[PDB]
Amino acid sequence: STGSATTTPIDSLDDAYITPVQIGTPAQTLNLDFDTGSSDLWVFSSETTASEVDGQTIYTPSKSTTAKLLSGATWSISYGDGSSSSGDVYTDTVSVGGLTVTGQAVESAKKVSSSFTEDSTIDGLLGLAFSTLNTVSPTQQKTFFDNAKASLDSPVFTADLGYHAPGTYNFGFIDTTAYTGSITYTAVSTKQGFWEWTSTGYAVGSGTFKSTSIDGIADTGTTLLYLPATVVSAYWAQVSGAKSSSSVGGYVFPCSATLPSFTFGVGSARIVIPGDYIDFGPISTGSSSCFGGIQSSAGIGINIFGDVALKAAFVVFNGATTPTLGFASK
């Protein structure tokens, strides 16, 4: 089998992407944030504290004839951005772009933190990291991809995120029309449960490439590119007027400035992030100070190749027995 679904930016800055997902019978369609940095499929629901729901579409398991309580199961997650959610668990039929999994764990939120409430466009998350990170207790549950894998034509999914435009998540096949050149594959460590890999270096604009190992994660659920402070400083030093602002919480720059591209290495291959992808607009409405899309990972504890990086490439998440990651230009 295969599936193919369009993923759409939630706003004009590509702060996140939402993908429609069918849950239950008859189908209830929720717009989920596909997140290769986590491993829980959780949704706003009829069980979510009323005061914490503000415009989201909810899953109502009592209206699904295929929903079954996963008795005794609970879940609780906290994300790198400080947000969180928790609740109980049903199994139900879940379809993405034509691909159907029966008995998928659907984690129903009883509580969500304010940032989730405040984002009317995201109805939940669909985790695509390794199932070892799944938070369901007492019985850890598998991701949608893990459940689908054996049925897929090939045990892979791909992320083709757009810049200020829709893109595509495919399951079970590689669309050879969606990228230019060749796909370069690179080793993955699953030791932390992430799609963790090592970039071979970077360049700033037309500058010479610096060969240096940068271990990080391919994370569709993170907006920006978070890299070591040395790398980030070298980037912003090439932007007139850019500065790190402790009050804002990262690098800012005047929008009158031209942003250089940023290149990262995948083996001997190179992915070029155009300068415009690094512009996240005014820090507040009407401000001449713009927020940067490349920020320091110092004190996150891990480097994160988030949407800023991934949307410059066609990315293969290869879930073969030994997982790997593939990157192509597009």
Q: Which amino acids are annotated catalytic?
A: 35, 199
Contacts of 152 (CB under 8 A, 6+ apart): 1, 2, 99, 171, 172, 173
Rounded CA gap, 268 and 180, in Å? 16
Amino acid at 86: S
Is 3:71 a contact under the CB 8 Å cutoff?
Answer: no
Nearest Cα to Cα of residue 94 among 151, 154, 172, 148: 148
Distance of CA 27 to the CA centre of its chain: 24
Is 16:38 a contact under the CB 8 Å cutoff?
Answer: no
How many helices (H) and strands (E) would you count in the chain? Answer: 4, 24
Is 138:75 a contact under the CB 8 Å cutoff?
Answer: no
